[PDB]
RNA sequence: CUCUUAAGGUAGCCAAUGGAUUAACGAGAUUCCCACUGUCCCUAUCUA
């Protein structure tokens, strides 16, 4: 369940989109091809919402959330907030956050149960994350790399970290998140995996430049297809050895 | 408009703001960090002898002592006494987020205020002892 | 060769979690999602996509999408309602409140 | 022909030197593959770690400054060829601190190829800046190729003046058919040609300055009724093995027109002794060039506005002192046999 | 695509449906187009077109002559076959050259008030061991760019031209002053090294120096051409 | 608009002509950037090329790591001190002029950006928005 | 590695190159000079003519020299392939002729600018400029044969398939008419011709496929006869060099129905003769055309 | 008849010093740096 598409000839899907288990957010720029690419996989099962954050298109980088809540930065206008509320059902809470780190998608890497945050967020922001998203919160870096939301892609099934993450850090973060983690690249050698792709428990979307070994690793770690667990690493070891 | 005000308050010659200096003085950890700085070659006095209130580096301990024995430092200390005038003050003056401003003022009076005063007293006695 | 050993190991290893608490974290899949039918590009009876609607109306760059058509409101007649913003120098949004 | 080798009318259908057998063919191909892989590793050590990787990030090295091209102008080289064409004797002036560095080998080759009747000798100037044994060793080694005379140029307190004068009188007596002989002084800039001429004349007849390019046109000086001396502007022959750092450290360019002298200060550290540097600048305790510059600036009071040390100014002064001889240094002569 | 993919495409799919007819009609129009080009092209392009037409016509006539000739129908050793290659001078009289043309006045001084230096504008031979005189005493100036050392010497027998070094300037016909200055103009008798020509006398002596006469103007064409006097 | 930029760019008041020095906002070790060229600049007699927020320039490092110095690299302007108009209805400006080091494809050399980042630059360059922690 | 050499600019022949450079000089430089002008202006006019023509010839020669590959510096497989195709000796000799012509043009330009410094009249300056251009033209006209050879070589070498000698490779070899091109068509999307006569394929053909998320290249080679290397020809030398150089999996194809025109004894003999070629490479023997006759019901 | 390449391991012997690489001064001539700025991008406005 891993697909490839582009937003106006750009492979950075996570920059221009946000994907949870219950809703999807897409930028309003240009045609309807990006929205239709999401709609071909999602149908009418979950709402897909055209939105802007502070008049910009970088909604996956400016916002963060999961199936229970959505956090928007303080630069979000009242009209955008009202549009999001009218588009989404009551089961999704919506909160505007007074946080200095306005790039919520960059500074928060979360799923339905756990969250990794920037080590310098406000205490009130941390408590608001715990209250709205309903998740445990940990101040962490991905092997010394701040902006965990842009350098990690996380779901309830697994996680993909940037390839410069040490094995000890991978083990520590895997213990914190209670999901299997793997280090890898997306979009043909890019290290910004969280801004490169979006993923939930049943769908992953990457750029067109993502190679076959990268797509296979993504499917293995996020457990997308029916016969694709995280233990097919032994089967894909030969391909990964040839690729690396 | 005039040349003096232009060449003093040009954008590229801006100085640190009172609310930021108040936040620096509020916590003891920040005071310790600003007192113990790494040796920087781009700062006067190798980054040492730094007055937090004026946000100003001195080349020598005698320069810092003379700065402390001065009306400019006293003016800055007098300015740093009350509420630091955030956006909430102007909002409540206009009639906006009045409860938030009142809660902020109460928290400043109760928790932030006396701790900042004690940190300032400790910094003063430390400078007196080391000078 | 011993040169391509440590990098290969570090990129082939998959870290595994271990307990740390007795809290169940299960993946969430909606019933509509798991009952959704697979989209077929070559199928006489397929869903009409947004790009299809755009192409049949104006095409890319001409079609003006109504963003209020997806609103989940109590009354369907309230979709095309203009929300007031300014009244006598006040913002209506910071007065808007239940009860 | 090419037409038979390849094209519509080609007649070549078999290899000219066919392989003896498949075993020889596979052995030759395996050897060629091994040599190719070794060569690829050898060039990946330097060139791929250098030039190739820079284009991936779009980085380009900054333009080479024109202050390093001084001494290579057409007017200067026309003057050089004029003085050679007018000279019967040519004195090549070398610096005793770096004589092989300050040699014009291409000019020597041109003289020995095209003008074999012109007599070329070496004068090793600034011998007061090296130990006695270093100068003796350099004289001995250079005498294996050309007659070399040690010298120290000064109007008042000089060395070698009488030896040079008697050698010139010998040349004049050898060319007794000629009514006079001309001796042209060539070499690198700042090696002291004008100083040597002023020493011979016991009078300041040619302008002398530490700045390169002080002499811009040729000058005739009457030493005796039968002996003329020709002062010439300094020349820097173009080369690829000589880098900008070597050109700067040979006293060729003006330090005031270089961009970053702080990066050349490590050259001073590698060329000078620690004891000599600490005696000259009354400082110690540095571990690198940046620390040396910072300590010297703070001791000398070269602080910019705001307490920042003046790295560029201190570096320029250090380079000027190195070139003008306020720091002792020399290049070791070749080993004795 | 790889190898001869266009030829493979022609073999597998053919060409455009009107290709043959269009090519035939263009080749039929070619005569009218050639005539219109000849009558319409102006200037340099017209001159070049006429020149190329003349060359093509000459080539066609030669081809026709060769075909008609075909349809109508040194006593070297074995090792040399199948291998290929009065006492009057040839120029007894040449154009006279005055001193005004020969020399150029060179002015000296800050106000350029002195005019005693003269520069030779023709090519010269200065010999071996030449050193320029000091500038204060240099009246006659022979610039280095005009100095020659070699010449293209043509032998009448065997019809070969060799690049030979110049040995001396024997006689410049204009003036003995030019002869002793070494001026190389047309009609000048020079001495050349003929070592590579392999000439042997009757007595077995190897000839390595002979006389030649300059047949061109080196100041005009940048080179010295001479004919060996045999 | 330059290679790697995401779409078209509307006009912003130019604040940095050739010869200006701006701060370096990334963590690659450079301290300041000296502008020598502006990518996409037009041509007019006597007129200096100038860059605004969200433009790509060619810069040389003056202060920072010596390995980074003595080289010309692409940079993207993320802050400017000259006030410019936003279409939402306000003129605004930053404290300083600041840029980040990038590649011709618009990818950051560093891993994070310190300080605020302009909305226009973040929207025009996806990698800047990915490495930004503060966007206005 | 570069692996492809299509981006080589067109090499004009001698007369066309002469026309291009000389007419570029005549068009792009001013053409009106008067005998009543200053001698400095006249000299500068003719110097500019000579220098511009020399620069044009030199830049054409440099565009030729930079474009073509260095035969000795490429991978040995590519070196052997280009030696078989284009005769490396002639290749290097033609390129060296181009380089020497460039040097001669530079020398003529420098010498005649220096001579034009001393021109005394418009007639003399015109003669010196005409002499410089005529000498350049003679130098260029001496390059008639290498330029034509290089143009043909460029056109051929721009269409060579790109082969990576360090990637995963399946070589296909055997006698003619056994099914090598048919197998390449089956496993790839290459458009190699399949015809029932020997040596339909006269050069290496490349196809690609994906197995276990990895890219593999398959190489179809022309047929090999059971002959020694002394009487072996260039078409077979292509296959021999490919087998010797490309560390790969070699598939030797055999026809048991002998409809290829070669007996089973001859095919076994050819396999044993090319046996020393595949050392430290994977080897597999594929028996094709099993729909006609199977290995089980053989004699 | 003969002449010059004996000098040796980062400072020598020989007579504090081995000097004009001379301090200070200058409406003398020249180069560079910090600061500074309408010299410039690119010009606008005010007074007599
Ligand atoms: N110590 C020492 N310095 C010298 C000697 N000869 C010249 N210098 C210095 O070198 C500098 C440049 O000399 P100069 O004659 O202008 O070099 P030129 O370019 O060859 O003419 C002058 O400032 C002199 O003081 C020498 O024999 N000994
Ligand atoms: N019956 C049958 N014929 C085949 C098979 N493979 C190839 N051929 C025939 O063999 C002829 C030539 O084969 P080709 O592909 O050109 O072999 P190549 O010369 O080695 O490239 C074609 O006309 C095919 O019809 C096969 O598997 N079965
Ligand atoms: K000098
Ligand atoms: Mg001089
Ligand atoms: Mg101008
Ligand atoms: Mg075939
Ligand atoms: Zn103070």
Numbering used by the authors:
A (entry chain y): 1 to 244
B (entry chain I): 1 to 131
C (entry chain b): 350 to 448
D (entry chain m): 136 to 472
E (entry chain r): 2 to 74, 85 to 96, 117 to 261
F (entry chain V): 2 to 137
G (entry chain b): 1 to 299
Paper text:
Because of the proximity of mG2922 to the active site of Nog2, we investigated the effect of G2922 methylation status on Nog2 engagement of pre-60S intermediates by obtaining high-resolution cryo-EM reconstructions of Nog2pre intermediates from SPB1 (2.3 Å) and spb1D52A (2.4 Å) strains using dual affinity tags on Nog2 and the biogenesis factor Tif6. In Nog2pre intermediates purified from the spb1D52A strain, Nog2 occupies an identical position and maintains all of its RBF, RP and rRNA interactions, but the Nog2 active site is strikingly different: There is no density corresponding to the GTP γ-phosphate, indicating that GTP hydrolysis has taken place and that GDP occupies the Nog2 active site. Additionally, unmethylated G2922 is no longer intercalated near the Nog2 active site and the A-loop is only weakly ordered. The high resolution of our maps allowed us to infer the coordination network in the active sites of the GDP and GTP-bound states and to define the ~1 Å shift in the orientation of the K-loop that occurs after GTP hydrolysis. The overall structure of the Nog2pre intermediate is not affected by early Nog2 GTP hydrolysis, indicating the γ-phosphate is not required to maintain Nog2 binding. Here, we present cryo-EM reconstructions showing that failure to methylate G2922 causes the premature activation of Nog2 GTPase activity. Because the presence of Nog2-GDP did not cause any structural defects or instabilities in late nucleoplasmic intermediates, we instead hypothesized that the 60S biogenesis defect of the spb1D52A strain arises during the nucleolar/nucleoplasmic transition of pre-60S particles. We hypothesize that premature activation of Nog2 disrupts this process. Stable Nog2pre intermediates can nevertheless still form if secondary binding interactions involving the Nog2 N-terminal tail can form to compensate for the loss of the A-loop interaction by Nog2-GDP.
